[PDB]
Amino acid sequence: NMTLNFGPQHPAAHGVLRLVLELSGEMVRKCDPHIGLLHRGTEKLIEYKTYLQALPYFDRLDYVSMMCNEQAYSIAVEKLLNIQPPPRAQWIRVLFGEITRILNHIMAVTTHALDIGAMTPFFWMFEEREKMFEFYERVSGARMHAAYIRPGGVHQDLPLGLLDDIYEFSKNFSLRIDEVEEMLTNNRIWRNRTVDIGVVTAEDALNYGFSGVMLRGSGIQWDLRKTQPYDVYDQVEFDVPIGSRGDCYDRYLCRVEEMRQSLRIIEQCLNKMPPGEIKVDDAKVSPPKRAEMKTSMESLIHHFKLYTEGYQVPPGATYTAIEAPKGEFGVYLVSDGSSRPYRCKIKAPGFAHLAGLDKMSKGHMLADVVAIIGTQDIVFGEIDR
Amino acid sequence: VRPRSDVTHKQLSAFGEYVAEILPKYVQQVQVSCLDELEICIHPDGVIPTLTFLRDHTNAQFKSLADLTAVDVPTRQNRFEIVYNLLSLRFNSRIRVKTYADELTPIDSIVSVHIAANWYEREVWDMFGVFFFNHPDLRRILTDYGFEGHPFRKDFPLTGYVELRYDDEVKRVVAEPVELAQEFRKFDLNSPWEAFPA
Amino acid sequence: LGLREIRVHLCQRSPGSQGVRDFIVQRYVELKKAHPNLPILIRECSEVQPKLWARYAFGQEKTVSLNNLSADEVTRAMQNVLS
Amino acid sequence: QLITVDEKLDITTLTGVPEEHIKTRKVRIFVPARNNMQSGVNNTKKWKMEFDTRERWENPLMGWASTADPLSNMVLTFSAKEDAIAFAEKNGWSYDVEEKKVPKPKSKSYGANFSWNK
Amino acid sequence: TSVKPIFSRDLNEAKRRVRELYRAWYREVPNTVHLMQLDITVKQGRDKVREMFMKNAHVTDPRVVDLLVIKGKMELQETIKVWKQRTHVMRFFHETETPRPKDFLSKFYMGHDP
Amino acid sequence: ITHTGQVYDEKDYRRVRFVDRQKEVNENFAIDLIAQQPVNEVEHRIIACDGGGGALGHPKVYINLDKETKTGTCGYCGLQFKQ
Amino acid sequence: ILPGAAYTEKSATYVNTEGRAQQTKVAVTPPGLAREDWKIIRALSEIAGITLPYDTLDQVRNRLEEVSPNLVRYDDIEETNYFQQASELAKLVNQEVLADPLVPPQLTIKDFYMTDSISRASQTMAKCVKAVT
Amino acid sequence: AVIPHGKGGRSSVSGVVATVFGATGFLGRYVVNHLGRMGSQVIIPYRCDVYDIMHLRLMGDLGQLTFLEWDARDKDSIRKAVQHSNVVINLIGREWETRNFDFEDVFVNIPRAIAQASKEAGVERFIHVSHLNASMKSSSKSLRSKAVGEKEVRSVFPEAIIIRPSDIFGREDRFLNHFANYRWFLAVPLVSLGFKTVKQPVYVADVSKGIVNATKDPDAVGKTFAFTGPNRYLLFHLVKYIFGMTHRTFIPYPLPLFVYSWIGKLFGLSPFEPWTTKDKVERIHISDVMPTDLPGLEDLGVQPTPLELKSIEVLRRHRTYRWLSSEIEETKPAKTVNY
Ligand SMILES: NC(=O)C1=CN([C@@H]2O[C@H](COP(=O)(O)OP(=O)(O)OC[C@H]3O[C@@H](n4cnc5c(N)ncnc54)[C@H](OP(=O)(O)O)[C@@H]3O)[C@@H](O)[C@H]2O)C=CC1
Ligand SMILES: [Zn+2]
């Protein structure tokens, strides 16, 4: 088992992973993943920043699912304040929440293939991704790292015309997923490198805290979006894609199926989004509209205090978890009465998944390790935080 | 104003009593937040016993460990507040069991109860310095290989004490005491006026 | 031994200092009248036993403890200092 | 069974602080006063211990303030004087506690302002 | 007082562990200087080990000592199971940094706050 | 040179920075550009300067042009108005 | 010229009129090569061969304790005094109070604005002085 | 002046604005390193394309290192470089007389114009570097020409420090690498079979630190320091020692210099940086002069560093996989010669 220190060789990437390994020839005896190559301090930095100026950190925690992460902090800060977002904002967050899930799955399925060696699916779907980014940009201003979902709702209403385009795209994206399929779902070769690789039992998946497709792929039925509804994911109707014979191929099929189910949720959101405001009306939590702060004294005072000092969340602590595309993303946000948080442990679906690499890739070849890092959608930002 | 259902604050409250009764040797306080979240508090010795009862009890199956974290209240004699958040896919409820550990009074490890904790416990040692007995392999996970000091402790400087640059003379990366070119501006933000009785 | 200054660091309301303070009350004036230039410093320490610090010539300072000493012993010790 | 130690918990050896900043840094435990500008007293409640201030030289390229002292911006907040003193002792930093000074009671009554002879 | 023992009931038992670690490091110094192609002398390195093991000679409390070796053992593991490359090891020697004088006159001549 | 008379002394070395390079400055200086705009002769004691453009301008403020001698100047635009 | 610091720039001690010793804290590091007053004199001594025994502030303070009590105990007025023996020596002293009226130097407020060095060097104080004049 | 504020590392200020014309050099690289570490303002006049001076950028901090385009023949370029510097350090030198620059130019002609302007500018101090044992009559045109310069510059710039280093020992140096690279040559010629040319190497850093310390010390004015080393050596042990660490056979065979000066002439004809130089050859067999002079290292504040100590790093690249892991302890030391 000559340690090879593989992974600083940019072989599965997804970030920078020094997967020190001991391999008797081409068989892996033990995988000890090393982490922290991307630790940056996100958890300590937040303690020194106000709630609204810590929102941009969450987009960077796992930036392939830029927004879905923001929703988790939002929800958490809203709970602590016992404020809820307005009805239109909720639908928006579910609209962009799902668009983001697609974006993550297009990343996970196509990047999985690039490591496997199939390169054309990535270019096919990165063009669709591109088109989605443009939604982000025309809603937030940034292609990724938007900062659109803030603790009290969305920042600004959708541009006048976005919904129509999030339709044209959705109306077609399916065929794009269909194509990838005709290239990989039944490839006589995709199956081999993926089938029966990294099988994880159901009991073991719950035990190692997998909590994601990784659980769903093993047949455990748990979607925090159906079990513990957040926002208005309760008002929509979608089917969790549960899997059997959990293995790299089965979970994949699950990720392609949630891409499909998210188009079902996006359709609805476009069909039923309400007229209304996109941010709470409590100037206490949400910043006042710029026409108001420039004509009304109470609004300037509320604008000045909110931007300079902060929300001033009531003292308490909460663990709120959503179903980020990777898995359960949760923020444990302890908070003193101050405007700046006290602690904000980010639970990363990924710290648990990597740990499982050892119990998944046993008696496996070097190529198998590459396939399994792909089937965990490891974004080193969330793991390293 | 958020919608609150008291069904949960009642269900969870009752469970709290149930846990407390079943594990009275360790449960010190059991509270339900106004946010409908239970937070049994246990003596550090009850780490193994309280978790195991929750992982393997028919009326309370709490199979997966959502997270293991340690807030650091420097004022508190026992500095760290290890918090374990658990989920029950069977009863669709989460509970949090939180204990207290000082810097040199280690806590037991639950890698036995949940193997998810193998990594998070290493994370708590690296950042806060709490030690976990009976851990299979406790070693720094997130910090650099030669890092000295536990970073998330409230008493550790944000910028830290060492930074890295490449030195030609020695043709190798080299630590030097941190010298920052614009110190972190420490805006004082607390207002001198309170908000409510709380 | 050139004497430049004498510091009597008595400690008020302290049991031991009783003697020192008594000296101040009864004989301080006299000592000063006799040595009308020398600076005799009456200072008030705390949680410390009294000390008759003396500064001799060329920056040398010498110490004589006055803890629990009678009024005349304080007078005798002071007289021994300015020989 | 427990073991006995009379040694003041000093854990200076585990904290991981460079030697220079443990032996040359004096921290002051004080309850913050109120900027006279505002009359609110919610920032004069909890004790804080703050490390001694150090060099802040101007930066040549942009004129930004630059500091070589890591423990400068760090101010830890402790609820009671006893707990803050404990932090200094086990971390090995020197301490000089300042007693809280609270406004003395002041007698006020609107009638006085209309006094026959004030 | 009345503390719970971490791993060593008394400074005596604890010291036993320190002895073991010293030996460990002593036996390892040579290997590292060769597997990392470090430009140092085994003797030189071995003195460094001594330096560190004594930098913390003053600790009297058993619990503090026990953690110190746990931590010490962890460092060794990172250097014998090599995950710490030269840059990491040489840092111990503080080779690039300019030494600061501790003489008062020296400091006066250079820094506002000594 | 710059808006604030920022001119590196003849001996300062940051002038090396400008060696072989342009020290960026703007010809259009505000202190002067506002002066050009004439005083607005309003006929009401108190007038408001919304900043021009309403929401696209500056916070609305009312100016008292009562002082006959001087002219009101919006703390924001610098625009001056006289009665 | 051996430049020193100002009370905004050193952890020195001062005492007001009823002997309450108080501690200035360093708000800003002293400017230029300028140094804390106590060190310049400790250093000059080391360059002279009589070298003051104190090398760190805490030591200079311990020094203050041996020469005087108030200096080390802060915020603490010294209760007892010995007025009676003071009078006895006053009675021994014989002097003539000249008929010249005793006059405070600060007769009106322009007198007040500029007195010490920092005050004299004040542009704000100078503006205040001309406003009065 | 610039009051020195800071703790001492990068992002701190020391107040030394210094033009350094030949920084790209082996010695230079080191000079900019310390100057940058200390926090000094360093102006690096350069002629080679920007690609080659990138190695100097990370050294020093932002806005602390400024690079200026400069041509030796063009007097104006030197003029603007020293416009705002208060310290000028001259390291201009070469071993091969190039088509468009003669030993005079690189050593005496150019280094004069430079200090000349520096004075016009009003730079507080100028440090001029000339090779050790440089007689106005020494055999090698190089050494003699260098001697010629140290005189002239004194008239253009009085009280201008003149450090005079021996051949330098350091990674990327010639003294040590040259001999080690004789491997390609099956036999390693050594005049007088490498005898009677005792040599005292000096670590590059020591030289650099010394030079830097000069910039920040009033004691050195008109001083002609000589950084030498911690131990002398007959060229024989040096050559073998090198081959020793390189772990390559040592075959000392004597070669009559009269013929060897000719070999230097041969490579000298090379268009691309002749590897050996007629002027080199002589220099190599030019015995190191004795140490009776304004002391350099130690005198200027740095204790010399023995050759054997860091030799391992300089000669490692020349070993083969088989010996890469080998360490200094395994190898033997060379012997000094107080002679
Ligand atoms: N063993 C040694 O290195 C010794 C060196 N010295 C002296 O120390 C000085 C530095 O030596 P070292 O660094 O090895 O020399 P290098 O060969 O490394 O060159 C030094 C610098 O001089 C510049 N230079 C050379 N010729 C010209 C020219 N015609 N016009 C403009 N610039 C020029 C080079 O710039 P570019 O490459 O861009 O042309 C280079 O950056 C030398 O002057 C030498 O006399 C003394 C004793 C021993
Ligand atoms: Zn205006």
Q: Rounded to a whole number, what is the distance in Å from the CA of H324 to chain E's nearest CA? A: 8
Contacts of H159 (CB under 8 A, 6+ apart): H125, H221, H222
Q: Give the β-pairing of B162-167 and B172-177.
A: antiparallel
Helix axes A120-139, A162-184, angle to 10 degrees: 170
Report residue H229 as tokens. 């080393």
Is A254 annotated to bind a ligand? Reply is yes
Q: Are B191 and B185 in contact (CB under 8 A)?
A: no
| Closest C-alpha to ligand 1, atom 43 | H93
Q: How far apart are CA H13 and CA H37, in angstroms?
A: 10
Domain count, chain D: 1
> Closest by alpha carbon to D57, among H173, H14, H207?
H14
Q: Which atom of ligand 1 is nearest to the CA of H165?
A: 47
Cβ < 5 A residues, ion ligand 2: F 49, 74, 76-77, 79
Would you list the domain boundaries of chain E?
1-114
Contacts of A179 (CB under 8 A, 6+ apart): A124
G58: left (phi over 0), alpha (psi -120 to 50) or beta: alpha
> Closest by alpha carbon to H228, among H312, H172, H299?
H299
Report residue B77 as tokens. 């004699």
Domain count, chain F: 1
DSSP states of D74-111? -EEEESSHHHHHHHHHHHT-EE-------PPP----GG
CB-CB neighbors (< 8 A) of C38 in chain G? none
Location of structure tokens 């003596």: B43
* Burial (CB count within 10 angstroms: exposed 0-12, middle 13-18, buried 19+), residue H48: exposed
Q: How far apart are CA A104 and CA A177, in angstroms?
A: 14
Q: Rounded to a whole number, what is the distance in Å from the CA of A134 to chain B's nearest CA? A: 33
Amino acid in position H163: I
- A-F contacts (CB, under 8 Å): 16
Q: How far apart are CA A312 and CA A335, in angstroms?
A: 9
Q: Rounded to a whole number, what is the distance in Å from the CA of A37 to chain E's nearest CA? A: 13
Q: Are H93 and H129 in contact (CB under 8 A)?
A: yes
Q: Are D10 and B144 in contact (CB under 8 A)?
A: no
B187 shares contact with chain D (CB less than 8 Å): no
* Residue A237 burial (CB count, 10 A): 10
* Residue E112 burial (CB count, 10 A): 25
DSSP states of E14-44? HHHHHHHHHHHHHHHHHHHHHHS--SS-HHH
Q: How close are the terminal C-alpha atoms of chain H, in Å? A: 46
Q: How far apart are CA D45 and CA D61, in angstroms?
A: 41
Report residue A241 as tokens. 């894609």
Q: How far apart are CA G105 and CA G102, in angstroms?
A: 10
Q: How far apart are CA B130 and CA B124, in angstroms?
A: 6
Contacts of A6 (CB under 8 A, 6+ apart): A19, A20, A21, A366, A369
Please tell me the total number of residues recorded for chain H in this structure.
339
Phi, psi (degrees; rounded to nearest 5) at E68:
-60, -40
Measured between alpha carbons, how far is residue A237 from residues B92, D27, E50, E91 in Å?
A: 19, 60, 68, 58
Q: Give the β-pairing of H42-46 and H65-69.
A: parallel
Measured between alpha carbons, how far is residue H50 from residues C69, H44, H54, H93 in Å?
A: 85, 12, 7, 20
List alpha helices for F1-83, DSSP H.
Answer: 15-18, 30-36
Q: Give the β-pairing of A343-347 and A328-334.
A: antiparallel
Measured between alpha carbons, how far is residue A201 from residues A208, A251, A349, B8, H283 in Å?
A: 11, 13, 18, 32, 77
* Domain hosting residue D81, numbered range: 1-118
Helix or strand (DSSP H, E) at H138: none
Cα dihedral angle (H257, H263, H265, H268), rounded to 10 degrees? Answer: -130
Q: Are B104 and E67 in contact (CB under 8 A)?
A: yes
Q: How far apart are CA F64 and CA F72, in angstroms?
A: 6
Residue H48 in contact with ligand 1 by CB distance below 6 A: yes
Please, what is the Cα angle at A246 between B93 and A119, to 5 degrees? 115
Which residues are paired to A3 by β-bridges? A22
> Closest by alpha carbon to G72, among G34, G21, G120, G36?
G21
Helix or strand (DSSP H, E) at H30: helix H26-38
H316 shares contact with chain E (CB less than 8 Å): yes
Strands (E), F14-75: 40-41, 46-49, 61-64, 72-73
B129: left (phi over 0), alpha (psi -120 to 50) or beta: left
Contacts of G69 (CB under 8 A, 6+ apart): C9, C43, C44, C45, C46, G78
G26 shares contact with chain D (CB less than 8 Å): yes
- D-E contacts (CB, under 8 Å): 44
Max distance between CA atoms of chain C, in angstroms, equals 35
Phi, psi (degrees; rounded to nearest 5) at B149:
110, 155
Q: Are H246 and H183 in contact (CB under 8 A)?
A: yes
Contacts of G9 (CB under 8 A, 6+ apart): G26, G27, G28, G29, G30, G31, G34, G36
CB-CB neighbors (< 8 A) of A33 in chain E? none
Helix or strand (DSSP H, E) at C28: helix C18-34
Q: How far apart are CA B55 and CA G113, in angstroms?
A: 77
Max distance between CA atoms of chain H, in angstroms, equals 59
Q: How far apart are CA D4 and CA E3, in angstroms?
A: 6
User: CA B173 from chain center: how many Å?
Assistant: 34
Q: Are A256 and A105 in contact (CB under 8 A)?
A: yes
Q: Are H204 and H169 in contact (CB under 8 A)?
A: yes
CB-CB neighbors (< 8 A) of G31 in chain H? 3
Query: CB distance B192–D40 less than 8 Å?
Result: yes
- Sign of the C-alpha dihedral computed for residues C9, C13, C15 and C20 taken in this order: positive
Measured between alpha carbons, how far is residue G63 from residues D97, G53, G57, G71 in Å?
A: 21, 9, 10, 10
Experimental technique for the deposited model: cryo-EM
* Burial (CB count within 10 angstroms: exposed 0-12, middle 13-18, buried 19+), residue C37: exposed
Q: Does an interface of 3+ CB pairs under 8 Å exist between A and B?
A: yes
Q: How far apart are CA B151 and CA B138, in angstroms?
A: 17
Q: How close are the terminal C-alpha atoms of chain E, in Å? A: 36
Q: How far apart are CA G15 and CA B43, in angstroms?
A: 52
Report residue G70 as tokens. 């108030």
Please count the helices (runs of H) and the strands (runs of E) in chain A.
16, 8
Q: How far apart are CA E112 and CA D34, in angstroms?
A: 30
Q: Are E61 and B119 in contact (CB under 8 A)?
A: no
Three-state secondary structure call for residue G54: coil
Would you list the domain boundaries of chain H?
1-339
Residue H51 in contact with ligand 1 by CB distance below 6 A: no
Q: How far apart are CA A65 and CA A212, in angstroms?
A: 14
Q: How far apart are CA B53 and CA H7, in angstroms?
A: 56
Report residue B92 as tokens. 């669709």
User: CA H276 from chain center: how many Å?
Assistant: 17
Q: Give the β-pairing of G13-15 and F80-82.
A: unpaired
Q: How far apart are CA C52 and CA C42, in angstroms?
A: 10
Amino acid in position C13: R
Q: Give the β-pairing of D75-78 and C60-65.
A: unpaired
* Burial (CB count within 10 angstroms: exposed 0-12, middle 13-18, buried 19+), residue H286: buried
Q: Rounded to a whole number, what is the distance in Å from the CA of H34 to chain B's nearest CA? A: 9
User: CA H284 from chain center: how many Å?
Assistant: 14
Q: How far apart are CA E78 and CA B143, in angstroms?
A: 13
SS (H, E, C) chain B: CCCCCHHHHHHHHHHHHHHHHHCCCCEEECCECCCCCECCEECHHHHHHHHHHHHCCHHHCCCEEEEEEEEECCCCCCCEEEEEEEEECCCCEEEEEECCECCCCCEECCCCCCCCHHHHHHHHHHHHCCCEECCCCCCCCCCCCCCCCCCCCCCCCCCCCEEEEEECCCCEEEEEECCECCCCCCCCCCCCCCCCCC
Query: CB distance B168–H59 less than 8 Å?
Result: yes
User: Within 13 Å, how many C-alpha atoms sit on residue G129's CB side?
Assistant: 13
Report residue A304 as tokens. 């000045």
* Burial (CB count within 10 angstroms: exposed 0-12, middle 13-18, buried 19+), residue G80: exposed
Query: CB distance F58–A291 less than 8 Å?
Result: no
Report residue E47 as tokens. 């003195």
Report residue G127 as tokens. 């503006």
Please, what is the Cα angle at G107 between G105 and G109, to 5 degrees? 115
Three-state secondary structure call for residue H171: coil
Q: How far apart are CA A229 and CA A241, in angstroms?
A: 17
Location of structure tokens 């008062």: E104
Q: What's the CATH number for A1-385?
A: 1.10.645.10
Q: How far apart are CA B182 and CA B195, in angstroms?
A: 34
Max distance between CA atoms of chain G, in angstroms, equals 53
Contacts of D104 (CB under 8 A, 6+ apart): none
DSSP states of A2-69? EE--BSTT-SS-SS--EEEEEEETTEEEEEEEE--TT---HHHHHHTS-GGGSHHHHHHHSGGGHHHH
Q: Are C31 and C40 in contact (CB under 8 A)?
A: yes
Q: How far apart are CA H41 and CA H18, in angstroms?
A: 6
F41: left (phi over 0), alpha (psi -120 to 50) or beta: beta
* Domain hosting residue F20, numbered range: 1-83
Report residue G49 as tokens. 């061969």
Mutate to test the pocket of ligand 1, among H19, H20, H24 (most ligand atoms within 8 A of CB): H24
Report residue H215 as tokens. 């910039």
User: String of b and e for A25-60 (b: at least 16 CB within 10 Å)?
Assistant: eeebeebbbbbbbbbebbbbebbbbbbbebbebbbb
Report residue E31 as tokens. 């290997």
Q: Are C78 and C52 in contact (CB under 8 A)?
A: yes
User: Within 13 Å, how many C-alpha atoms sit on residue D15's CB side?
Assistant: 23
Q: Give the β-pairing of D65-67 and H42-46.
A: unpaired
Q: How far apart are CA A208 and CA A262, in angstroms?
A: 27
Contacts of B164 (CB under 8 A, 6+ apart): B173, B174, B175
CATH class of the domain comprising C1-83: alpha beta
Is A31 annotated to bind a ligand? Reply is no
Q: How far apart are CA G17 and CA E7, in angstroms?
A: 59
Which residues are paired to D65 by β-bridges? D58
Contacts of A31 (CB under 8 A, 6+ apart): A19, A20, A21, A357, A358, A361, A369
Annotated resolution, angstroms? 3.1
> Closest by alpha carbon to A194, among A370, A17, A15?
A370
Q: How far apart are CA H331 and CA G100, in angstroms?
A: 97
> Closest by alpha carbon to H192, among H158, H236, H159, H142?
H236
Strands (E), D15-74: 26-30, 47-51, 56-58, 65-67
